[PDB]
Short mmCIF file of C-alpha atoms in Angstrom, two decimals:
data_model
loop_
_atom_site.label_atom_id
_atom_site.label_comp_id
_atom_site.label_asym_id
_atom_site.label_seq_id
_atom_site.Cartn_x
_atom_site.Cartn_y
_atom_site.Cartn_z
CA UNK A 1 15.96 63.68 122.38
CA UNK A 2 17.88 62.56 119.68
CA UNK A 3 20.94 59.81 120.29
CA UNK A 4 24.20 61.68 121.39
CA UNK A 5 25.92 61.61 117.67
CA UNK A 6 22.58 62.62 116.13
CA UNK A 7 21.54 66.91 115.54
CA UNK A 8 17.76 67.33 115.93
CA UNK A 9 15.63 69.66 113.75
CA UNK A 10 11.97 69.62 113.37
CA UNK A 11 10.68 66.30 114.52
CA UNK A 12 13.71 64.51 112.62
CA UNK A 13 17.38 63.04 113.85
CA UNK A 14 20.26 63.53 111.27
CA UNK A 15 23.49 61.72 111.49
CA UNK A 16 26.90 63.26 109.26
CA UNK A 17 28.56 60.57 108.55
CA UNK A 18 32.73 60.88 108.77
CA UNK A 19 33.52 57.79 106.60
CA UNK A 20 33.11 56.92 102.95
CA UNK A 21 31.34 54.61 101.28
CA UNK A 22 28.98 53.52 98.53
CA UNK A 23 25.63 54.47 98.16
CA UNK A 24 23.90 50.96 98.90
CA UNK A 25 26.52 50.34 101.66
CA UNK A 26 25.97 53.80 103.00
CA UNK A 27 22.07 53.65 102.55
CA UNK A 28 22.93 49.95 104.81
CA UNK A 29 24.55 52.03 107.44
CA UNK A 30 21.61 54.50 108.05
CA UNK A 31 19.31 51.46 107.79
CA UNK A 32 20.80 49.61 110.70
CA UNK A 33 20.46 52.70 113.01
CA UNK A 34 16.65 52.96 112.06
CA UNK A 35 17.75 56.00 109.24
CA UNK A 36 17.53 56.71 105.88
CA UNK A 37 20.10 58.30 103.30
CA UNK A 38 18.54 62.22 103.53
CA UNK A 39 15.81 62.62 101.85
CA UNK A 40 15.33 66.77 101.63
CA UNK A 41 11.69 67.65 101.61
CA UNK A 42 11.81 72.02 102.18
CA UNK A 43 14.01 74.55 101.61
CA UNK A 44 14.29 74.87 105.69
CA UNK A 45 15.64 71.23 105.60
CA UNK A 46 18.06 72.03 102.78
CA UNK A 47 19.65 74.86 104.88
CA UNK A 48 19.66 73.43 108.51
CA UNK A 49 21.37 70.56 106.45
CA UNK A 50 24.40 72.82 104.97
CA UNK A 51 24.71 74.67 108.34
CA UNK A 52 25.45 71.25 109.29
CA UNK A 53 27.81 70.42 106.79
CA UNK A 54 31.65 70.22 105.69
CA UNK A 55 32.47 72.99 102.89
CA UNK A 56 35.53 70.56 102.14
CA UNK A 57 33.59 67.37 101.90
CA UNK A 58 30.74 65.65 99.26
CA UNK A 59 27.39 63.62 101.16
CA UNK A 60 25.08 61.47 99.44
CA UNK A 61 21.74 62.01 99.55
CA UNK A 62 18.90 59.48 99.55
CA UNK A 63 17.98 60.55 96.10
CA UNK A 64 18.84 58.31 93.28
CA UNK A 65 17.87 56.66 89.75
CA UNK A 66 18.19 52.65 90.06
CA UNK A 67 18.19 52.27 86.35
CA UNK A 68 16.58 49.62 84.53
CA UNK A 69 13.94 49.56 81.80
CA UNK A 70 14.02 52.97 79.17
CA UNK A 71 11.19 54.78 78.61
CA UNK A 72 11.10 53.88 75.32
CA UNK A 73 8.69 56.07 72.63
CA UNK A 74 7.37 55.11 69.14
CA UNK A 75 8.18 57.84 66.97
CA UNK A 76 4.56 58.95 66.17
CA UNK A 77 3.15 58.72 69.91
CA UNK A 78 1.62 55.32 69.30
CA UNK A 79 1.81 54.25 73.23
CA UNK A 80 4.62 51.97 73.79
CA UNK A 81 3.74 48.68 75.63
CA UNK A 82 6.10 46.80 77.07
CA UNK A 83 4.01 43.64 76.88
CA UNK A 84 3.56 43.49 73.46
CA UNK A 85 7.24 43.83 72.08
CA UNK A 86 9.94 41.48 70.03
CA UNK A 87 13.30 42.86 71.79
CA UNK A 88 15.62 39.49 71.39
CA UNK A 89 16.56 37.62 74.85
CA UNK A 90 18.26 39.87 76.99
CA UNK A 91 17.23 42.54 75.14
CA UNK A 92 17.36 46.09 75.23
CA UNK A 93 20.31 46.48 78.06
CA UNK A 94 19.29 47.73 81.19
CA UNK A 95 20.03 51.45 81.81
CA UNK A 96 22.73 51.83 84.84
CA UNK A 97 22.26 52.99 88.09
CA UNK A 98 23.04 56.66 88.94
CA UNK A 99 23.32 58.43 92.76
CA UNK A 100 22.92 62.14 93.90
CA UNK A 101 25.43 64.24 96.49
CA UNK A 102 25.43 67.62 98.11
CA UNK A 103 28.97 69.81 97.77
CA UNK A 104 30.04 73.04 97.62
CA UNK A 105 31.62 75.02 95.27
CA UNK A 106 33.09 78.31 95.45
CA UNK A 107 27.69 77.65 96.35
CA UNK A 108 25.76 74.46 97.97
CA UNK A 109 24.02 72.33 95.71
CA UNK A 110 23.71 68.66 94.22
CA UNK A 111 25.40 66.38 92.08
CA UNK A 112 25.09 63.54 90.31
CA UNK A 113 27.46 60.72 90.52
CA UNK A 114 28.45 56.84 90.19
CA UNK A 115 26.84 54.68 92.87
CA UNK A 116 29.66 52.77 93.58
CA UNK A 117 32.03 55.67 94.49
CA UNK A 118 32.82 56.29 98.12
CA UNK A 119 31.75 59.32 99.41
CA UNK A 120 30.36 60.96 103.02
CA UNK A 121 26.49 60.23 103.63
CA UNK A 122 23.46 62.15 105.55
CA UNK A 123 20.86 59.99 107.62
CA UNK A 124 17.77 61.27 108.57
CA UNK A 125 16.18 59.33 111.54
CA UNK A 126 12.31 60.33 112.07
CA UNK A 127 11.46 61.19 115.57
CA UNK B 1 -1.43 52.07 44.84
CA UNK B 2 1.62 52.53 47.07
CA UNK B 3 4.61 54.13 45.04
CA UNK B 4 6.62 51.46 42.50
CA UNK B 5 9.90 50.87 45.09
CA UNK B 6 7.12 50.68 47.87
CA UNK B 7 5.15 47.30 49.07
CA UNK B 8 1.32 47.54 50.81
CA UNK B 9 0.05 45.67 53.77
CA UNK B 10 -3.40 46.55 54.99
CA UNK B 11 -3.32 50.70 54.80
CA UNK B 12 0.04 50.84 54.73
CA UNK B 13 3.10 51.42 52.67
CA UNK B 14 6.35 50.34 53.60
CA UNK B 15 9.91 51.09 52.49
CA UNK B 16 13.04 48.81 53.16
CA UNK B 17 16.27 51.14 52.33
CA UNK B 18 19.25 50.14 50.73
CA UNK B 19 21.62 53.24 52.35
CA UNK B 20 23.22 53.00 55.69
CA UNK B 21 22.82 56.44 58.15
CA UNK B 22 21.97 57.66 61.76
CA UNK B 23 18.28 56.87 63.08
CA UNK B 24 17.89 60.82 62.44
CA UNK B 25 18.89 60.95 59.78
CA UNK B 26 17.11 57.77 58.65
CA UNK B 27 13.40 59.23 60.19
CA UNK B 28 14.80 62.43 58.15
CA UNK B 29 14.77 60.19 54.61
CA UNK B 30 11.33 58.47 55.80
CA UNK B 31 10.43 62.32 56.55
CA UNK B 32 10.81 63.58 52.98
CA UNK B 33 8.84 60.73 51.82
CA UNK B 34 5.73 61.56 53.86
CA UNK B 35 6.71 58.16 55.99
CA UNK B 36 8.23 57.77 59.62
CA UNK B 37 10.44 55.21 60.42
CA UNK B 38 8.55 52.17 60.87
CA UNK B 39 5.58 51.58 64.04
CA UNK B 40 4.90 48.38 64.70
CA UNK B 41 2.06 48.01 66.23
CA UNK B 42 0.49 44.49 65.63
CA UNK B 43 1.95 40.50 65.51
CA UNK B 44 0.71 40.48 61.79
CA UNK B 45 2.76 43.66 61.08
CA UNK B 46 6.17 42.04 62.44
CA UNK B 47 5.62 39.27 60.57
CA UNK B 48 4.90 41.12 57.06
CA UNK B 49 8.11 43.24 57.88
CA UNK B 50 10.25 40.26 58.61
CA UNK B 51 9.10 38.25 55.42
CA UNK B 52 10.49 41.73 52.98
CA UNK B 53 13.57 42.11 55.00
CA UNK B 54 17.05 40.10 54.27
CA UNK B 55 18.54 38.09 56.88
CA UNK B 56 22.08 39.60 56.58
CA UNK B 57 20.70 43.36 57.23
CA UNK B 58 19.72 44.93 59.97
CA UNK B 59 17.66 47.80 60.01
CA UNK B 60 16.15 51.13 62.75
CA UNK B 61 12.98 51.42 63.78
CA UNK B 62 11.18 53.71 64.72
CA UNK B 63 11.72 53.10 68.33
CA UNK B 64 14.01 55.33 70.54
CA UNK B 65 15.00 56.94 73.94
CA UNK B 66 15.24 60.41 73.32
CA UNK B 67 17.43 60.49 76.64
CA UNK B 68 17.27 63.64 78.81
CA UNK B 69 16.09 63.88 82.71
CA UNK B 70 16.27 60.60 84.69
CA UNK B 71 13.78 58.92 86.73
CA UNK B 72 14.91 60.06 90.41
CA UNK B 73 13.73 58.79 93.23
CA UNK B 74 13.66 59.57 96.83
CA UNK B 75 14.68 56.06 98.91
CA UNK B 76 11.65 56.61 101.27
CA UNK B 77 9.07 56.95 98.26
CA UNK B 78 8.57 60.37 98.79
CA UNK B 79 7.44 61.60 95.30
CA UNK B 80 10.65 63.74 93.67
CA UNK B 81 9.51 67.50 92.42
CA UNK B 82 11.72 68.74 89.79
CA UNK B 83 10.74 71.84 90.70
CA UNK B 84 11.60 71.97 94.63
CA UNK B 85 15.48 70.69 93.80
CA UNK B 86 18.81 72.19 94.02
CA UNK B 87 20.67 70.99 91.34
CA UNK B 88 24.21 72.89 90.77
CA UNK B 89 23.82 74.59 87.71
CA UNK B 90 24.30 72.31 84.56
CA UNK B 91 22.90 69.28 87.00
CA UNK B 92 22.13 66.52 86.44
CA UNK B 93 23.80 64.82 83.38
CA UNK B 94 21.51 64.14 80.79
CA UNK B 95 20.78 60.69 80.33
CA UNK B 96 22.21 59.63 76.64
CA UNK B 97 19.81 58.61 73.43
CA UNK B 98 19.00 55.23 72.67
CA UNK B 99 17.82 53.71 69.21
CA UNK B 100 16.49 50.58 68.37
CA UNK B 101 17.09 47.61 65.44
CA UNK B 102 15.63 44.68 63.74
CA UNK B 103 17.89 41.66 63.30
CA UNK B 104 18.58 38.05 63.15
CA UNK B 105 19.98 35.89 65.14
CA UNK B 106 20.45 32.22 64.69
CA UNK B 107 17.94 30.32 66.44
CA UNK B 108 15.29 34.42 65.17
CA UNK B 109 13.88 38.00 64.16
CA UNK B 110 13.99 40.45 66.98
CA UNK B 111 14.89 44.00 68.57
CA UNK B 112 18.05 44.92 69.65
CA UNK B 113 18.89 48.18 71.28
CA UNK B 114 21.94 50.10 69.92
CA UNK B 115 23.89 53.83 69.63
CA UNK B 116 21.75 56.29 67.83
CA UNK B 117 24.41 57.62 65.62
CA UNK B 118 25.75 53.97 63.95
CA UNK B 119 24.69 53.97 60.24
CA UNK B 120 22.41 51.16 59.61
CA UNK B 121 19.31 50.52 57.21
CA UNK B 122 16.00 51.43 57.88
CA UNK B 123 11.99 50.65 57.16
CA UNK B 124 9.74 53.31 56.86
CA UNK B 125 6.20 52.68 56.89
CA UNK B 126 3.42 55.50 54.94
CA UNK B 127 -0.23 55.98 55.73
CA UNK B 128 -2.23 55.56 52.80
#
């Protein structure tokens, strides 16, 4: 009962994407179909995924660190509160953003990566 | 009754060094002494540190990102389980150390974030 492009498993949709693209702009494109980037729950999901798959090609997954704030420690475990600091303005910088992918090498597994790279991308629709 | 090269505020003794060398090695130093690199912990601390420290120096605390695992997140919210992953082996890159420094700026005293491994000065603080 899934849309013609999509493979069903479970109660879910997923959607292999053929063209490359950031993660935001790919995360866009599963959006506008009523998707998300894959977000891989079980170990039956993982492998109905790579039977699915490309060995030749590199997906993102909805899996991803947006960066920001550190976690920032005193060095004797005195709790570190954020609203009681004296960082100058603009300060400390803000950690960068970082994305994860699924590829195989010679076997499947995940990666992590640059967001802004263009790579393949897995949606998974929830039926 | 803190050491002769040491100063006292409240229960504490502090230490403003002279040499320049990595945070580690800097909490190291403070180590040896039975100190840490400094805590700060109150408004009335900052301010005693900043009125021993010279405006020209700048100097670790002892404030840090060790680094290591990042903070993933699935995009739907669903809580992420180390444990339940599969990461290639060697996967993920470690996120890098991060140390942090008192300075000033013109127009004042503050914390900046910076590389671990620069040399700079340092304060350590010892419980009395």
């Amino acid at each position: 009962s899934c849309p013609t492009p999509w493979t069903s498993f479970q109660s879910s949709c997923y959607f292999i994407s053929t063209g490359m693209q950031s993660w935001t702009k790919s995360q866009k494109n599963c959006s506008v179909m009523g998707a998300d980037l894959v977000v891989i729950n079980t170990r039956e999901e993982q492998d109905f995924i790579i039977q699915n798959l490309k060995r030749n090609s590199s997906y993102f997954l909805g899996l991803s660190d947006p960066g920001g704030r550190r976690h920032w420690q005193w060095v004797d475990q005195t709790p570190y509160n954020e609203n009681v600091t004296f960082w100058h303005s603009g300060e400390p910088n803000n950690l960068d953003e970082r994305c994860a992918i699924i590829n195989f090498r010679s076997e499947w597994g995940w990666n992590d990566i640059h967001c802004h790279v263009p790579q393949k991308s897995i949606c998974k629709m929830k039926k």
